[PDB]
Amino acid sequence: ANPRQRNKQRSGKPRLTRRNANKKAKAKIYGNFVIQQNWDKHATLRQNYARLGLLATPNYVTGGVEKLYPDPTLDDVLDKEISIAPAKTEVVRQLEEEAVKKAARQSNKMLPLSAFEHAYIQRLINKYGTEDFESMAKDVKLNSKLFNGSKLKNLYIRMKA
């Protein structure tokens, strides 16, 4: 009806048709590979999370859930410790096993000293002993960078390993 739409109707040129209309279609999973492998492309996201043994929401649900079958004291809260929780399904066990095995592999958190760091701490140790770090930091000539006792202690600890 609009003159623009009448203009393109009267033209002999084809329309810029695009076919993107498919409802009932749910987004495919990218990101986690374990989830994608075990995902059910037909089931909803709640049905998939429950089957995989995950929580789709850490809070309440704001409606009625689907029922398919006829089913048959401050001290002891801030100080108690809960020993994690069981993995209900196999999918969660794969996620847990993968997490611990990657954390063990990427666990080297000890920094070795460099050439400058080694010489810096060596000059301080060979003059002010080994157990006295406060006197090491209070030196002005050898400790030119003015590192405090904690940093010199860390330089010692990293030198050992």
């Binding site: 409802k23 749910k26 987004a27 495919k28 999973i29 990218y30 990101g31 986690n32 374990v34 989830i35 994608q36 995902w39 909803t44 996201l45 999370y49 995989l52 995950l54 929580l55 789709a56 929401t57 850490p58 809070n59 309440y60 004291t73 401050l74 809260v77 801030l78 108690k80 809960i82 020993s83 994690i84 929780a85 969660v92 996620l95 847990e96 993968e98 997490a99 990657k102 954390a103 990427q106 080297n108 920094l111 070795p112 000293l113 460099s114 050439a115 400058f116 760091e117 080694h118 990293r158």
Partner: protein, 116 residues
């Protein structure tokens, strides 16, 4: 001026697809963040427990989660709210601790330079 609701079923479906599109992006983690439990601010509703906005800094400190890492693991922070009673502190610290008991945090890769 009349506001019709012929798109009410369409909006229901559009929001469902947003939930699924979000879950497609973040595969194993919940589509919502954990909300605290608070009390409505009036004599009519103060006996009810509802969901809050985020956890106070004193709640996070007691549970052992620093405010800088709380957001990274899906724990909202409310700098505005405060714990005026020891009951609200205990109700939401336990909520955080139960949340951390059920949490699998996948490790991240870190850059370790060869030298010191």
């Amino acid at each position: 001026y009349v506001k019709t609701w012929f798109n009410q079923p369409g909006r229901k479906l559009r929001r469902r697809q947003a939930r699924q599109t979000k879950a497609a992006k973040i595969a194993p983690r919940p589509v919502e963040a954990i909300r605290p439990a608070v009390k409505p601010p009036t004599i009519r509703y103060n006996m009810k427990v509802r969901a809050g906005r985020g956890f106070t800094l004193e709640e996070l400190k007691a549970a052992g989660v620093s405010r800088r890492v709380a957001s990274t693991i899906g724990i909202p922070v409310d700098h505005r709210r405060r714990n005026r009673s020891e009951e609200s502190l205990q109700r939401n610290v336990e909520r955080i601790k139960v949340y951390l008991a059920h949490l699998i945090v996948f490790p991240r890769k870190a850059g370790q330079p060869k030298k010191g």
